[PDB]
Write an enzyme that holds these catalytic residues in place. Structure first.
Site: not given
Ligand SMILES: COc1cc(-c2cncc(-c3ccc(C4CCN(C)CC4)cc3)c2C)cc(OC)c1OC
Ligand SMILES: COc1cc(-c2cncc(-c3ccc(C4CCN(C)CC4)cc3)c2C)cc(OC)c1OC
Ligand SMILES: COc1cc(-c2cncc(-c3ccc(C4CCN(C)CC4)cc3)c2C)cc(OC)c1OC
Length: 283
Positions: A14-17, A21, A133
């Protein structure tokens, strides 16, 4: 004593403002690493201050591992380290999954459970917390079919919220700002919108709606504060309930529930504990 702290960053998820992550690795296990932009340092400070106050532990709250501040030459590096949920966000998951009755109810009751845990004061315990939020990108899907709530960067204990999910009292600036219950009622409005997003993806009689975000049909992408105020406050629009829901007892009950999260009068809205009880009696 050896303190092995190095985390290997493996892939950006994940990438944003806000920043970025990453999936990372520590001692053979996946962790999620949120790297904050200097623009959003206050979210790291708020979430860290909350976890220094109360170490939240709940199956439906993203699991905290660590907060790190590292000194760099010309900057401060701020990381939040949590459990990693490989299925990703509920927003992600609803795009190209449909749901059955059991999986839809399990998702929404798990969200309600995490929200009620935040909202409740426990004595002797935890302060009451409002999220501020809540949205489908801030909910992660776990392998067991339950979800967990993420991102306490705006949370309040007893940056502004995502405008698409803002309650009418936030948009018309009438919210009672000194009143902690006001903030719970803003989360309940947002919960109702998430409930609608999920319910659309539940199949009944061979029919499902495409994934759409709340208010997709009445506001632009990245809607302005005024765009939202006109829809929600002045015209008092609410998300559409499709006719096909009224053939299905589960979606009929969920429509009633979402309406009781969307009252203009914040004090008329259901509480998270009342939402849980209602969901345990559906099906
Ligand atoms: C919302 O916020 C936060 C989220 C997370 C977080 C925790 N587990 C897993 C994720 C993740 C993993 C994988 C994918 C994709 C990529 C692989 N594939 C191609 C499809 C799936 C998306 C998301 C995230 C983003 C952590 C955070 O803080 C450390 C966050 O902020 C508080
Ligand atoms: C500083 O930084 C990081 C540290 C670690 C980490 C690595 N090994 C062991 C530990 C550990 C935990 C707990 C105790 C307790 C044992 C009982 N005693 C009575 C009190 C002390 C000791 C040691 C930690 C905390 C991981 C990190 O990230 C993955 C760190 O970076 C954020
Ligand atoms: C930060 O995160 C992780 C940390 C660790 C970890 C590493 N060294 C030591 C510990 C530890 C040992 C013992 C106590 C004591 C405290 C009081 N006493 C009465 C009983 C127990 C506390 C802490 C831990 C918890 C492992 C983790 O995962 C396996 C972590 O998660 C990724």
């Amino acid at each position: 004593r050896t303190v092995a702290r190095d985390i290997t960053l493996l892939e950006c998820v994940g990438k944003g403002r806000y920043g970025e992550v990453w999936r990372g690795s520590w001692q053979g296990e996946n962790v999620a690493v949120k790297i904050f932009s200097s623009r959003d340092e206050k979210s790291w400070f708020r979430e860290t201050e909350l976890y220094n106050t109360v170490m939240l532990r709940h199956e439906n709250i993203l699991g905290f591992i660590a907060s790190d501040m590292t000194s760099r030459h010309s900057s401060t590096q701020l990381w939040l380290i949590t459990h990693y949920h490989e299925m990703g966000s509920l927003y992600d998951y609803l795009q190209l999954t449909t749901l059955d009755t059991v999986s839809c109810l399990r998702i929404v009751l798990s969200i309600a459970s995490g929200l009620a845990h935040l909202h409740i004061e426990i004595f002797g315990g935890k302060p009451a917390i409002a999220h501020r939020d809540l949205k489908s990108k801030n909910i992660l899907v776990k392998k067991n079919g339950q979800c967990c709530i993420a991102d306490l960067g705006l949370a309040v204990m007893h940056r502004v919220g995502t405008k698409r999910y803002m309650a009418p009292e936030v948009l018309d600036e009438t919210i009672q700002v000194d009143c902690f219950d006001s903030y719970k009622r803003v989360d309940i409005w947002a919960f109702g919108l998430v409930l609608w997003e999920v319910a659309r993806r539940m199949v009944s009689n061979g029919i499902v709606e495409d994934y759409k975000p709340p208010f997709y049909d009445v506001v632009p992408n990245d809607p302005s504060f005024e765009d939202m105020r006109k829809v929600v406050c002045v015209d008092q629009q609410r998300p559409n309930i499709p006719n096909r829901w009224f053939s299905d007892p589960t979606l009929t009950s969920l429509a009633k529930l979402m309406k009781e999260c969307w009252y203009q009068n914040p004090s008329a809205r259901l509480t998270a504990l009342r939402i849980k009880k209602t969901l345990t009696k559906i099906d």
